[PDB]
Amino acid sequence: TLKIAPSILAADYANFASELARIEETDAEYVHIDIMDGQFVPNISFGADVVASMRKHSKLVFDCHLMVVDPERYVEAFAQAGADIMTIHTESTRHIHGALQKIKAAGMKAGVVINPGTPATALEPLLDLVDQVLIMTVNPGFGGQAFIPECLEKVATVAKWRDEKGLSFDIEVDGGVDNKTIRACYEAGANVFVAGSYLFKASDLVSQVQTLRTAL
Amino acid sequence: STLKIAPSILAADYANFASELARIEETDAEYVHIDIMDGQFVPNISFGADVVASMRKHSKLVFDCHLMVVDPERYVEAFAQAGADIMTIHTESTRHIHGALQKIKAAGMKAGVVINPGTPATALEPLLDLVDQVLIMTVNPGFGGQAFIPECLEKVATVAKWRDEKGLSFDIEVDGGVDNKTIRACYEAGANVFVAGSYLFKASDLVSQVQTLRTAL
Amino acid sequence: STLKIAPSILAADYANFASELARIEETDAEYVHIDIMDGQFVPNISFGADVVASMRKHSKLVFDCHLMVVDPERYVEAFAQAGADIMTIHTESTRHIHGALQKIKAAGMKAGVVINPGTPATALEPLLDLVDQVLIMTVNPGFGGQAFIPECLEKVATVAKWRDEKGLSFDIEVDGGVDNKTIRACYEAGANVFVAGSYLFKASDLVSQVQTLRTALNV
Amino acid sequence: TLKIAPSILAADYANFASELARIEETDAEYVHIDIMDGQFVPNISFGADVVASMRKHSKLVFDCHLMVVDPERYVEAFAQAGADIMTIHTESTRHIHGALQKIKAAGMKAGVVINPGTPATALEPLLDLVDQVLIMTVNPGFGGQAFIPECLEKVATVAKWRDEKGLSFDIEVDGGVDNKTIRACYEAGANVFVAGSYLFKASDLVSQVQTLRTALN
Amino acid sequence: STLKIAPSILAADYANFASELARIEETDAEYVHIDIMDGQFVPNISFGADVVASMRKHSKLVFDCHLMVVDPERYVEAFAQAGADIMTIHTESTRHIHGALQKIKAAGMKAGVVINPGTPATALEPLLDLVDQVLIMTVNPGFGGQAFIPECLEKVATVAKWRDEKGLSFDIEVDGGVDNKTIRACYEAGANVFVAGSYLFKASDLVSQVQTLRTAL
Amino acid sequence: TLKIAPSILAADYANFASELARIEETDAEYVHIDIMDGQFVPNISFGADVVASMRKHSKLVFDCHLMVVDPERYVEAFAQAGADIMTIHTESTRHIHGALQKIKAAGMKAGVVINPGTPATALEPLLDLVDQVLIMTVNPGFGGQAFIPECLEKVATVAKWRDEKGLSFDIEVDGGVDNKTIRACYEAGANVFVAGSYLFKASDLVSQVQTLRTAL
Ligand SMILES: O=P(O)(O)OC[C@@H](O)[C@H](O)[C@@H](O)CO
Ligand SMILES: O=P(O)(O)OC[C@@H](O)[C@H](O)[C@@H](O)CO
Ligand SMILES: O=P(O)(O)OC[C@@H](O)[C@H](O)[C@@H](O)CO
Ligand SMILES: O=P(O)(O)OC[C@@H](O)[C@H](O)[C@@H](O)CO
Ligand SMILES: O=P(O)(O)OC[C@@H](O)[C@H](O)[C@@H](O)CO
Ligand SMILES: O=P(O)(O)OC[C@@H](O)[C@H](O)[C@@H](O)CO
Ligand SMILES: [Zn+2]
Ligand SMILES: [Zn+2]
Ligand SMILES: [Zn+2]
Ligand SMILES: [Zn+2]
Ligand SMILES: [Zn+2]
Ligand SMILES: [Zn+2]
């Protein structure tokens, strides 16, 4: 099924609890949480203890995206913080396969993500292991960036592979997703759509999420 | 020479920074200590510049930002833009602590320098003339609730003495394990700014809990 | 293509390397697989070149050195002098895998290249013409006793296919979770060199234990 | 259009001005400038300020090749130094796509390069935004190295991809390119040829460059 | 006050750690000095915790582990389980030497701190209260058979003085270039624990070779 | 004896040959060469091969200052390039002592330098080993920066130690040294003065170096 995942990176950091409540008013089923350490990407967003704090105020799926170097050192912390899905970059560790096994052994769903410049082939050795494949549609680091349509080719490629192997993991897109681009993402083969800046620039979060469902 | 209390937001409810900041403004505290951690200088990641920027519009207190991150100089503009009033950086986090401090000052913020418990006081000697604040960690950086390290007070006395000899006037701050039973010693050692997280936020009545510190002094 | 067994000393009794090597020599194993770990490429530190140098006098077998260390090129000369016969390095451990392999050959050693489970077989393509051995990890590097990763055999087939297309003849090795129940599958996929640690050394009679692999190979 | 790009790394560093003049005497349209930081490769060559100083002594295309880690931090410096082309390594950053965008956004032509051991696949997601694809024919680091013919396989695969995508970026080769190897580079699909030692070992640069064009036939 | 001899297993026969440990137990040496090198803090890799663990059952002596590795804190648990009795770490190997020492003690082992030849004795002052041993390198870490560095004795003296003034009782160890001709000066400087590698293992009779040190003392 | 060391970092890079010629026309005895790798400091200047080509164009003392991480890997390279003195930062390696021994074993004069923020205590165990101690008077990176007076307190500390130990190494200063600041540097105890922007900003280099000789 098609899932909408509002990115909390675009919300009011001084009131996470009320922002989480606003999201739960919509029909979105996921909350996308961007962890940035200043190493993998230039800036620092927030870490596991912040996620743990958010956990107590939400019943949605915590879709954690780790834009940090050496993510395996945080598997235990995110499991304790209540992360439902942990998505890590093939570019952030020399042992992506083992890192993914670690996530699953910890009881969470395992997600793998690749940057716009990383070839889809970096995903092939991991298909039989992951629960989600995230294709970045903007270069990681911040919200409000321009959608990169070329990345949709990798979405198609992975969807084709999933079929050929008879696998069933979700395919997510993240970056520049809005009412004008989400349709292209769906057609390419994605079923999970992350949206930050677009959704949070509206006061009526419920209607904004609906503009995406309608665009679909 | 005035005594200031700096509640550490790291020990507060992260899901409600706004109300937590409002609680602090109810007390007589003049500073809000903000711990920035990047998973590199210390094991964990707390929050960054954009979170500070969000907090900024819900507080009129002094934003005493403490950067427990590697190569802090790259974040000077970000925190200036975020509304940080003081930027305190670790001598252990860069090979160019002097220039880094100059960058903070030129950016319009007050410059603070901090050293870990294992770092000798002499690491601060070459920086005395350019800082507005010297922070002596009294616990090993990383998290709250750790045991106070008395030996670190020797360094507070040492810096206070250097401040006098050179006739300087920067504030001397302590951070970690600061509570009603340890704050007096910090004061006697020569510190005038006291950061406190766990001891304060574990209490429901913050204004009252902050007063226990004032009284203890 | 000669089928070879390479007991991994990582699973042996570190307090008696000479003795353990003697036990290997009683078997029909042709290689001794030596895992060098530096605490950077993988979490643990095993042993270095000087330890390999000390083991050299107590064995007549092929020293198949596997470097799970960052920037392996800095150790080429050390291992050559320690007596390593094959030096196998990770594509993930250096930005210059091609040059690193050239350096191993220039030092008079056989050059091997290895890729982790999560690394695509294409990482191997530009290196086929220069190596003497291709190692496909069948467990994520780090330690023994791990579960075999079947999907990795897909990469063994792919490389064997490429080797055939280019008319090359390098050995194809597998390492990790190789035992009597998985070794045949490694063979059928295209491998001819099998590294085994925990499965072999958990047995007091190394000779019969190595034979069980030979039998499982059924070839 | 076939272009020759003399590599200044093989020239008299004590006289860049005169060496650049010697190049302008030939019919070479590019000046290949290798930037090395001692990290991506073992040696340090020269940086942006050197290129900036060279700028006014040449009217040719400054084809800058960055053999440094985290090249994005230098985009602005090279743009301001007068670089015409900025070619960066897929192996030098975890965000090659964004780095290329930064280059283009700064007004320079964007080039991407891969080492002999890096598969051509690393290039696929970047074909749309580059003005040049450089296939190293020697392991980066220094001149006089032996040509690696296997790398030409990647020159052909990219040429094919370019054709299949209706794209039109140049394809460059660099390393061990001489009068005996250039023809093969061309037949493989390359149209821009970097040459260091083969050209500068000669006293008559104009004649030496001509031997290369003659070799192309 | 108690003079102890610590043969360094780095100079022994690696292919026979068990028999080498037995040879040591034939002497009156009370410590086995175990050098852990990771190729990062120093150029070479020696052996790790698993090798130490394997050695544990073959010796009843004190395992005096010296970690020449970066970020040693990550190995405290491993060495504790390996049977290490003493864990000595370099101030130059972590930004949090104080907490690192605390972690060693919290794991049930004796905590030691060491400084390279080029590191000033003042780096030890903040740590005098929590250590059980202070190791002063008398050669630059990396390997054995190096030339003794007399100058380092000044730091042994400085620390023996501080121990006196503070009334502490930690051991003072020296390591590197210690033989029958240098051990005396080490002792005079204030050291009581002497690590010896090449000078001891170069002899067939380990029992009498250790005696030459006792007599030299 | 007092020495003047013009910094080639401030010269015209496209004509190193002619620039060195200008320096040789003055009575300056050293040519200060700043090696930057983009790691120790943010920029890259030039390496050992550049120095190598500079060697035959000068009979002066090549005083190479390495603002690079892990300088020991370059000892052999600079010894071959013709460096006469090799000065390294205590903040650039965990083994400053052995690094200095290496420089001497290589047949070069060993020099050690500390950043403005680095305490003089860092030099304490290195005095018996060096031929030169350099105290930065500006934060390393580039020329034209403001002189940092407080650093002279360190020039004085080392001078004092030198005497108490009866050693005879040179004491150099670098950064912000001009006709106005050089006098203080001398009174602080330094005897070797590096100057870049102040010297090269003038067409008559011979007289500019004399303005420093006079100010002394
Ligand atoms: O592109 P928009 O939807 O504004 O931003 C989305 C971001 O929040 C995204 O999740 C983040 O990983 C980008 O680095
Ligand atoms: O007051 P306690 O709970 O000891 O500590 C407070 C922390 O928030 C402290 O400011 C932080 O820098 C520790 O890394
Ligand atoms: O999987 P088993 O055969 O038990 O272990 C084998 C290991 O010793 C293997 O060689 C090593 O490279 C793993 O990092
Ligand atoms: O191989 P030759 O033409 O001599 O040298 C060419 C080099 O100067 C090349 O540009 C450089 O990027 C190699 O690292
Ligand atoms: O006693 P010598 O042979 O000088 O050295 C012995 C070594 O084993 C020493 O303990 C080691 O820490 C040096 O890095
Ligand atoms: O003399 P000024 O222009 O201040 O400085 C000259 C510089 O070239 C200096 O030598 C350099 O080490 C700064 O990093
Ligand atoms: Zn995301
Ligand atoms: Zn703090
Ligand atoms: Zn192996
Ligand atoms: Zn080039
Ligand atoms: Zn030791
Ligand atoms: Zn300099």
Centre a 10 Å sphere on the Cβ of residue A191 and count the other Cβ atoms it contains. Answer: 16
Residues in contact with D124: Cβ distance below 8 Å, sequence separation at least 6, in sequence order: A119, D161
- The DSSP letter of residue A209 is H
Residue A142 annotated as binding site = yes
Q: What resolution (Å)?
A: 1.8
DSSP string, E115-135: E-TTS-GGGTGGGTTT-SEEE
Q: Return the structure tokens found at D76.
A: 């602005």
E43 lines ligand 5 (CB under 6 A): no
Residue A76 distance to chain C (closest CA, Å): 16
What span, in angstroms and rounded, lies between the C-alpha atoms of F173 and C71?
37
Q: Does B79 touch chain A (CB under 8 A)?
A: no
The DSSP 8-state label assigned to residue C71 in this structure reads S
| C35 labeled binding residue | yes
**What is d(CA C89, CA C68) in angstroms, rounded to the nearest whole number?**
7
Question: What are the distances in angstroms from CA E145 to CA C116, E33, E118, E139, E176?
Answer: 39, 15, 19, 9, 8
Residues D78-109 as b/e (b if ≥16 CB within 10 A, e otherwise) read bbebbbbbbbbbbbbbbbbbbbbbbbeebebb
Chains E and D touch (3+ CB pairs under 8 A): no
Cβ-nearest to D96 among A89, A117, A121: A117
C66 Cα to the center of ligand 9, angstroms: 5
- Residue B98 and residue F136: Cα distance in Å, rounded? 11
Closest residue of chain E to C55, computed from CA coordinates: E15
Ligand 1 centroid distance, CA of A4 (Å): 13
Q: Provide the pairing of β-strand A85-89 with A61-67.
A: parallel
**DSSP per residue, D175-205:** SS--TTTHHHHHHHT--EEEESHHHHTSS-H
Taking the CA of residue B27 and the nearest CA in chain A, the distance in Å comes to 19
B165 touches E: beta carbon within 8 Å: no
Cα–Cα distance measured from residue B214 to residue B184, given in angstroms and rounded to the nearest whole number? 10
As a whole number of angstroms, the distance between CA D184 and CA C71 comes to 33
Out of B64, B85, B171, B175, which one is annotated catalytic? Answer: B175
Residue C104, phi then psi, degrees to nearest 5? -65, -40
Residue whose pair of structure tokens reads 């020479």 in the numeric block:
B1
The ligand 4 atom at the shortest distance from the C-alpha of residue D7 is: 8
Bridge partners for F133 per DSSP: F112, F171
Which domains occur in chain C, in start order? 1-219 (3.20.20.70)
SS3 B66: strand
Residue D174 CA to ligand 4 centre (angstroms): 6
Which atom of ligand 3 is nearest to C142's Cα?
Answer: 14
Sequence-ordered strand ranges (E) for A72-210: 85-89, 109-114, 132-136, 170-174, 192-195
Task: Spell out the residues 6+ positions from residue C98 whose beta carbon is closer than 8 angstroms to its own.
Answer: C126, C127, C130, D115, D116, D117, D139, D148
Distance of CA B60 from the midpoint of ligand 2 (Å):
22
For residues A141 and E213, give the distance between their C-alpha atoms in angstroms, rounded to a whole number: 62
Residues of F labelled catalytic: 34, 174
Please say whether the beta carbons of A58 and A24 come within 8 A: yes
Residue E65 in contact with residue E52, Cβ under 8 Å?
A: yes
Alpha-helical segments (H) within C57-106: 76-82, 97-106
Is E38 in Cβ contact with C38 (below 8 Å)? yes
Technique used: X-ray
Pocket of ligand 6 (CB under 6 A): F 7, 9-10, 32, 34, 65, 138, 140-145, 174-177, 194-198
CB within 8 A of C146, min separation 6: which ones?
A: C139, C140, C176, C177
Rounded-to-integer distance, Cα C80 and Cα C56, Å: 11
Q: Which of A15, A44, A50 is nearest residue B36 as measured by Cβ atoms?
A: A44
Interchain CB contact of A53 with D (< 8 Å): no
- Select the residue from C37, C67, C91, C116 to test the A interface by mutation, using most A Cβ atoms within 10 A: C116
Closest residue of chain E to F102, computed from CA coordinates = E140
Quote the tokens at residue A32.
Answer: 């996308």
User: From CA B51, how far away is CA B7, in angstroms rounded?
Assistant: 17
Please give the structure tokens belonging to residue C217.
Answer: 């190979």
**Which residue is associated with the tokens 């997601």?**
D125
- Tokens 């209390």 label which residue? B5
- CB of residue D47 inside a 6 A radius of ligand 4: no
Structure-token pair, residue A111: 């997600």
Q: Min CA distance, D72 vs chain A (Å)?
A: 11
For residue A133, which amino acid is it? V
CA distances from E78 to B37, E72, E135, F66 (A): 27, 10, 22, 39
- The answer to whether residue F46 neighbours chain D at the CB level (below 8 Å) is yes
> What are the contacts of E20-27 at 24+ separation with CB within 8 A?
E21/C15, E21/E55, E21/E58, E21/E59, E21/E61, E22/E58, E23/E206, E24/E59, E24/E61, E24/E206, E25/E59, E25/E60, E25/E61, E26/E206, E26/E207, E27/E206, E27/E207, E27/E209, E27/E210, E27/E211
**Which of C41, C93, C116 is the closest to A97 by Cβ?**
C116
Of A89, A118, A141, the CB nearest to D125: A118
- What is the crossing angle of helices C17-26 and C49-56, to 10°? 50
Contact exists between E and F (3 or more beta carbon pairs < 8 Å): yes
> Residue F76 belongs to what H/E stretch?
helix F75-81
Which of C28, C35, C71, C132 is labelled catalytic?
Answer: C35
Q: How many CA atoms lie within 13 A of A98 on its CB side?
A: 24
Interface contact A125-C41, CB threshold 8 A = no
